[PDB]
Structure 1
Amino acid sequence: GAVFKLMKSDFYEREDMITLKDIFGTETLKRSILFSFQYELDFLLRQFHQNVENITIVGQKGTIMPIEARAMDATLAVILKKVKLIEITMPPFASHHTKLIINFYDNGECKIFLPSNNFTSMETNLPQQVCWCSPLLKIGKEGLPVPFKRSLIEYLNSYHLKDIDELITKSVEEVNFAPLSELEFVYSTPSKFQSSGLLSFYNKLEKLSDTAKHYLCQTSSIGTSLSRARDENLWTHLMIPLFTGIMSPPILPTNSLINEYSQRKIKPYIIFPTEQEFVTSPLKWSSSGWFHFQYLQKKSYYEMLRNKFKVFYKQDPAMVTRRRGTTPARSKFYMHCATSQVFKELEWCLYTSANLSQTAWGTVSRKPRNYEAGVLYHSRRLANTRKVTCRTFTRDPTHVAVPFTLPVIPYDLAEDECFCLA
C-alpha cells in the first residue's frame, strides 16, 4: 500500500528509510517526471541509473542550476541528454512549490512519490525530510473513476501548458489508479479556472464529513497576519474556525475565538523549532536557514499565538534519537484528532508541500499564488480502518508516519521562543 518513509541523510546515517538513490537508482526505471521548487542538477542527476531513458523536469524559471563544465563528467553528460525541461515563469511573490515524482518502469509499472525536500544536496540532507510513496500502479485501462487521479489531472491541466498536456498528462492518463482509490490529492494552483487551496480543501472536508478537537499543523514557515489592522493567523483565525464550523463561507475577533475554543474544547497546535532546539541538533544551526518566521516587526502577533492561543509545540527531548536529536523537519502536516495518545488515531491527515501561508493556501476570497500538492488521508474514505492511524518515526504499520515526536510538548512559556532567522 502507500507508505511514509523517513529520508536518510548523509550526516545522520553515517554507516523504514529511503534515499533519492532508492527512488531514482533502480535499473528498471525507464522515465521520471519531476516537480520541485529548487533543482541542483549535478546533485539530482547523479541519483539516476544509466538505464534511464527520459527525465522530464517541471520547475520555476531561475531555480534550475545547470552543471558547470568543471563538474561535468562522462556519466553525467550521458544523463543530461535525457533531460527535458519545462520552465514555469512565476509572477512576483509566487512559487512553484510542489514536490512530486512520477516514475515509469520497464514492465509498465508506475509509482508516485511526494518527497518533502527539494532536489538540492543541502536541503535534502540537513533538515529532516520525509517521502510519501504510492502503492505500485500499472499502465492499463481504467475501471471506475479514482478521485486521486481525477484531482491530479485537474492539477496538471491547471498549468495550461501544452508541454504538460502532451508530455505528462497523456502519460498519467494511461495509468490505472485503482490502488489509490482510498486517498485524495489536494492541491493549490494560481489558475483562476480551477478552485484550489483552502477553499477547495474546506469544501472537500465538509463533503467527506462532546469531545476535544485537536488541530495540528507542522510547517517550516509561518506567514504574517492576514490583516494589516488586526492580529489574525491563518491557522487560528481562519482554517480552524472554518473546519470546526465556528464560521461559514459568505474573521472573528481574537477574544471571540478564544472563548469559542474554550467552549468547544478546541486545541490548536503549531510545530515549529524553538531557538533552543538548534543547540541540541547534531549539526546545530546548519538546518536553521529553512525555517522562516519573521515576527520581530509585529511582536503582538507572536505573543497572541504564543501566549493567548498557546499554539506552539516542540519535540519531546526524551523521545528523539541520538543521531537526529531535535533537528526540525521540512515536511508539512495538517491533521485533526478527536479524543498522551493524541494523534495516533486521526479523523484526517494532509501531508503536503504547502506551508502555513496565505500564499500557499489562498483565503476564502483569494486564490493561492503557489503551486502546491499533497495527499489527504480521511477516515471516512478508508475501507478496513475506522480512523487514520499515525505513528512517529522517532520510535521505529500505520497509515501515516511523522518525523516529529508523539506526543509533542507545549513550549515552556517561561523559556521557549520560536526560532527567528533574523
Structure 2
Amino acid sequence: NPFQFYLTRVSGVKPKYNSGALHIKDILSPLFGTLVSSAQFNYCFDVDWLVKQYPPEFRKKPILLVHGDKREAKAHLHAQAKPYENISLCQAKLDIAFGTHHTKMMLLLYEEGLRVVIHTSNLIHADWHQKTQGIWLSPLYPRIADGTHKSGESPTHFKADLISYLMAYNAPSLKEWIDVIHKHDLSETNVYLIGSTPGRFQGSQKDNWGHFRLKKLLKDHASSMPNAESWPVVGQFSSVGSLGADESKWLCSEFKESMLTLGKESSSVPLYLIYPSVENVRTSLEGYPAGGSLPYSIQTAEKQNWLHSYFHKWSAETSGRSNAMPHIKTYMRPSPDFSKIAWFLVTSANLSKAAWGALEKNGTQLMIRSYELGVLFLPSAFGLDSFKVKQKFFAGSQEPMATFPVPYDLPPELYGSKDRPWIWNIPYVKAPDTHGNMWVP
C-alpha cells in the first residue's frame, strides 16, 4: 500500500485487529534494517523500557534522546540514561514560555540505509499497550553513492523540509543527523512534512510552520471542488488548550480558516471535533487511568464551555479500537457524505494555540510555543483527486492505492445530552470503570 500509515498494536483486541498493526519491537526489529544508530525524539521517556524494545543485538548501538525537559525533570532523565553508556541526550531549546517538546520521531540509521518514523506515542509502556496511536513509516532510504551529486529530494520536498525542521534546534547532535540525511536518497517520499517549532515567524518564514504551513500546502497542492463549503473539517485530538472566550478568538477564525483552504483562488463549513467523553474513558480497556493521558483541566474547560458543543465521541469499530483511547491526533477534510477525503494529517499536535500557532502583531507574525511534527497525505501526491475512505481499516479494498485507512468511524457521533468531555482533574465516583475503580485525582 502507498500510504504506510499504521496503528500501534492493542493488547486485548482480536488478532484480526492487530494484523497490520505495529508494536515498537516490530519497528526496531532486524527485519526493518541492521541498526547502526538511532535518534528518539519524544516528550516522555522510560529509558529502561525503551532499551528493552530494541533487539538484544542492537541494544548497545548509540541512541540519542531528544527531549525538552529542564531543571529537576532534566536531571531525572539524565539519571534514567546514566546506566547506559551508549545513550546521549539533546535538550531542545524552549525559549518561549509554556512550550513543550511534543514531536515523536525516530531516525533509524542502518547498514542498508535510513528510515524515518513519525508517530504519536510516548516511549513508555502504557502508550503502546491499549491506546489508539498512529505511525507513519518512511521507505528504506538508500545511501547516495560517494562522489555522486544528486539532491535525493522528493516531489514533496520532504528531505529539505526535514533538514529545516532539524536545523531549528540549533543542536550539534542534530547537525550530525542532518549530515546523515544529506547522504541519503529520500526521493520516494510521498508525504509532506508539517512541523511546529518555537518562535515568532514573520515574512516568508510565516508559512514554514504550524497552521500556516498547512494552509500553504493546501493552497499549493490541493484544488477546490464545487460545493467545497459542504466538505466538513474533522479534528481529532487527546488534549485541548485554552482557545479563548468564544469561537471567533482562534478556533473558527484563523485555525478553521487554514483548515478549510483548498487551492489558490479566493463560513458554512461544518467542524467536527472528536474527543473522548467521560463514558468513553470509563468503559475503555484501561478504564479511568486512560484519562491520565487526556490532560484537559477543569480550569481551562470552564472558560470555554462553548467549545463542547463541537465535541463528538470516540468511536472506532472500523479498527476494533472503540475501547482503545486515542492518543493519536488526526485532521482531515471529508466529503459531505464522508465517503472521500481531500487530505489526511497525522501529527503530535493537539487542539491548542501552543501547537498550531497563534497570529500576533496585527496578523503579521505567527507565534508557536512548542515542537510538533506530523505528515500530510494529499491526493495530488499519489496521482489522485481525492482518497476513497477505507470501509474497514484492516480489510482488503478493491483498490488499496486509492483507499485511505481512516482509523475511526465516520460520521462522528455528537455527544449526548448526558455526555461530558473527559476532564482529568475532577473526580468521577458515580460508576466504576472496567477495572472496578473510581477516579479521585
Question: TM range, normalised to the smaller chain?
Answer: 0.7 to 0.9
CA contact (8 A) 1:29 1:51 kept: no
Q: Distance in 2 between matches of 1:206 and 1:37?
A: 31
CA apart distance, 1:45:
0.5
2:236 matches 1:218: yes
Q: Which amino acid is the alignment partner of residue 42 of structure 2?
A: S
2:173 matches 1:163: yes
**Aligned match of 2:213 in 187, 192, 200?**
200
Q: Distance in 1 between matches of 2:391 and 2:128?
A: 20
Q: Deviations over 1:363-399 (max 9, x none)?
A: 233321111111111123322x331344376664366
Q: 1:123 to 1:368 in 2, by over 3 A?
A: same
Q: Which amino acid is the alignment partner of residue 77 of structure 2?
A: M
CA contact (8 A) 1:338 1:347 kept: yes
2:191 matches 1:183: yes
User: Counterpart of 1:328?
Assistant: 325
CA apart distance, 1:185:
0.5
Q: Deviations over 1:340-376 (max 9, x none)?
A: x50x422111111111100011123332111111111
Q: 1:421 to 1:163 in 2, by over 3 A?
A: same
CA apart distance, 1:278:
2.0
User: Counterpart of 1:112?
Assistant: 116
Q: Which amino acid is the alignment partner of residue 419 of structure 2?
A: D
2:411 matches 1:407: yes
Q: 1:390 to 1:33 in 2, by over 3 A?
A: farther
Q: 1:153 to 1:300 in 2, by over 3 A?
A: closer
**Aligned match of 1:305 in 304, 307, 332?**
307
Q: Give the TM-score taking structure 2 as reference length.
A: 0.78
Unaligned runs of 5+ in 1: 249-259
CA apart distance, 1:87:
2.0
Percent identity between matched residues is: 22
Query: The residue matched to 1:277 in structure 2 has which SS?
Result: helix
Q: Give the TM-score taking structure 1 as reference length.
A: 0.81
Query: The residue matched to 1:216 in structure 2 has which SS?
Result: strand
Q: Distance in 2 between matches of 1:417 and 1:2?
A: 35
Q: 1:298 to 1:409 in 2, by over 3 A?
A: closer
Q: Which amino acid is the alignment partner of residue 177 of structure 2?
A: I
Q: Which amino acid is the alignment partner of residue 236 of structure 1?
A: C
CA contact (8 A) 2:355 2:369 kept: yes
User: Counterpart of 2:439?
Assistant: none
Query: The residue matched to 2:276 in structure 1 has which SS?
Result: coil
Q: 1:169 to 1:96 in 2, by over 3 A?
A: same
User: Counterpart of 1:43?
Assistant: 49
CA apart distance, 1:101:
0.7
Query: The residue matched to 2:5 in structure 1 has which SS?
Result: strand
Q: Deviations over 1:243-292 (max 9, x none)?
A: 4469x9xxxxxxxxxxx32xxxx110111001111232122112111113
User: Counterpart of 1:289?
Assistant: 292
CA contact (8 A) 1:225 1:232 kept: no
Q: Distance in 1 between matches of 2:30 and 2:152?
A: 31
**Aligned match of 2:277 in 274, 278, 281?**
274
Unaligned runs of 5+ in 2: 361-365, 426-441
The two structures, once aligned, show a CA RMSD in angstroms of: 3.0
Tell me which protein shows more strand as a share of its residues.
1
Equivalences for residues 9-20 of structure 1 within 5 A: 9-10=10-11, 12=13, 16-20=20-24
Q: 1:123 to 1:224 in 2, by over 3 A?
A: same
Q: Distance in 1 between matches of 2:318 and 2:279?
A: 16
CA contact (8 A) 1:7 1:130 kept: yes
CA contact (8 A) 1:6 1:393 kept: no
Query: The residue matched to 2:55 in structure 1 has which SS?
Result: coil
Q: Deviations over 1:191-216 (max 9, x none)?
A: 45754112222222222244212100
